[PDB]
């Protein structure tokens, strides 16, 4: 994660992120909608950060420092490059939508009025098919990644010292190897919760309520497809 986006998403809500003289200019309904939209982007930034810890810190760190058997690192971090591409692109579009909405003279005051169109695009067509295929693969390999990690930690001293070392900073407290895997698996089921609460506060413009209702139906169709395509792989 980069300092620019970390600071834009440091506050606990949109009402605390913007200047109070800008907050005062908006209706409470707008603030409620914006707080949930801010939470969607903030958690998407954290999810992308989680995927960067898996690819750059864990996966690459193991390749450059350890002497693991070929295919072992892939079994510990399945589909992480594909996932990191899917979510960094989605995050880029969310951050660009916020940036275009900033007032001139401001790096923090914005109102996102149109999100549904962006959500329909991510959860339909080729991008939806790539998320369905990547999550069905990832979640089917989830158990094996955990078992393989536990096998290497208990039997390999060098793997144990590598893990203890790269996970020692306080910022990585809730981001160990097993934590990253479950954080990734659970991400897809957070979307309907976030979108339904945004929709609850987006009835002001009928076009937006319809776009968010379509987006919610698409995310649920994706989730049901991923759920049907899963079968745990055993080693």
């Amino acid at each position: 994660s980069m300092e620019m986006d970390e600071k834009d998403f440091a506050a606990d809500s949109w009402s605390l992120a913007v200047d109070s003289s800008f907050l005062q200019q908006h209706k409470k309904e707008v603030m409620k909608q914006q707080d949930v939209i801010y939470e969607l982007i903030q958690t998407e930034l954290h999810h992308v950060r989680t995927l960067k810890i898996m690819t750059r810190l864990f996966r690459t760190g193991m390749l450059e420092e350890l002497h693991l058997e070929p295919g072992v690192v892939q079994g510990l971090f399945p589909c992480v490059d594909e996932l990191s591409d899917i979510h960094t692109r989605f995050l880029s579009q969310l951050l660009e939508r916020r940036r275009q909405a900033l007032c001139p003279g401001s790096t923090r005051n914005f109102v996102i009025h149109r999100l549904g169109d962006l959500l329909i695009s991510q959860f339909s067509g080729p991008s939806a098919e790539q998320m369905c295929k990547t999550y069905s693969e990832f979640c089917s390999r989830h158990s094996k990644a955990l078992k393989l990690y536990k096998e290497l930690y208990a039997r390999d001293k060098r793997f144990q010292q590598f893990i203890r070392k790269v996970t020692r900073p306080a910022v990585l407290k809730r981001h160990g190897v097993q934590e990253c895997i479950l954080l990734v698996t659970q991400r897809i089921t957070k979307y309907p919760l976030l979108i339904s609460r945004i929709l609850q506060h987006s009835h002001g413009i009928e076009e937006e309520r319809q776009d968010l209702t379509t987006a919610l139906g698409l995310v649920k169709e994706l989730l049901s497809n991923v759920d049907e395509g899963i079968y745990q792989l055993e080693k």
Binding site: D12, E39, T43, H142, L146, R174, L182, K190
Partner: protein, 178 residues
């Protein structure tokens, strides 16, 4: 400090996400209550023992029977939640959640937690429930359910007022240690 994993289970309207948020912040959020909970690792000292308690929610996974059990590996304690303002969420405990938690987590202690205990004294809650020939869950109904399913124990709390929240998590830590 030993590492222990806690998973909270229960129906959508049981208040499990709010319980984890109020515990991890040590406060009921004054400006915004988050929609979701990612994870958290609590530093807890119970009965002289320091433990790192990783906290996990199952919210959003209630409809996905193949995705939901991926939250269960290596669990040390299960918090099984129901809402005191919802007697229908208590009825789902023995025939839906209990067989699932016993299959995927054999020999893991379950604490049955009655949430929203403040609503037992709410006039709007008592009025809305009476229209469907119902009333708030009584403490003996919660205890009898915990007994029937073979739970480690029965506890109540209010995430809204913070009453009983710290106690549930210190007890869960003790349960995970046995």
């Amino acid at each position: 400090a030993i590492r222990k994993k806690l998973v909270i289970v229960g129906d959508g309207a049981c208040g499990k996400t709010c319980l984890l948020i109020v515990f991890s912040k040590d406060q009921f959020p004054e400006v915004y209550v988050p929609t979701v909970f990612e994870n958290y690792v609590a530093d807890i000292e119970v009965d002289g023992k320091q433990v790192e308690l990783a906290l996990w929610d199952t919210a959003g996974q209630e409809d996905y029977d193949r995705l939901r059990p991926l939250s269960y590996p290596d669990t040390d304690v299960i918090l099984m939640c129901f809402s005191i303002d919802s007697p229908d969420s208590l009825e789902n405990i023995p025939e839906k959640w209990t067989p699932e938690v016993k299959h995927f987590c054999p020999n893991v202690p379950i604490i049955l937690v009655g949430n929203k205990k403040d609503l037992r004294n709410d006039e709007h809650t008592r009025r809305e429930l009476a229209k469907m020939k119902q009333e708030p869950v009584k403490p003996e109904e919660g205890r009898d359910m915990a007994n029937r399913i073979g739970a480690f124990g029965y506890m109540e709390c209010s995430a809204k007022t913070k009453d009983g929240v710290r106690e549930v998590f210190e007890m869960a830590t003790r349960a995970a240690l046995q």
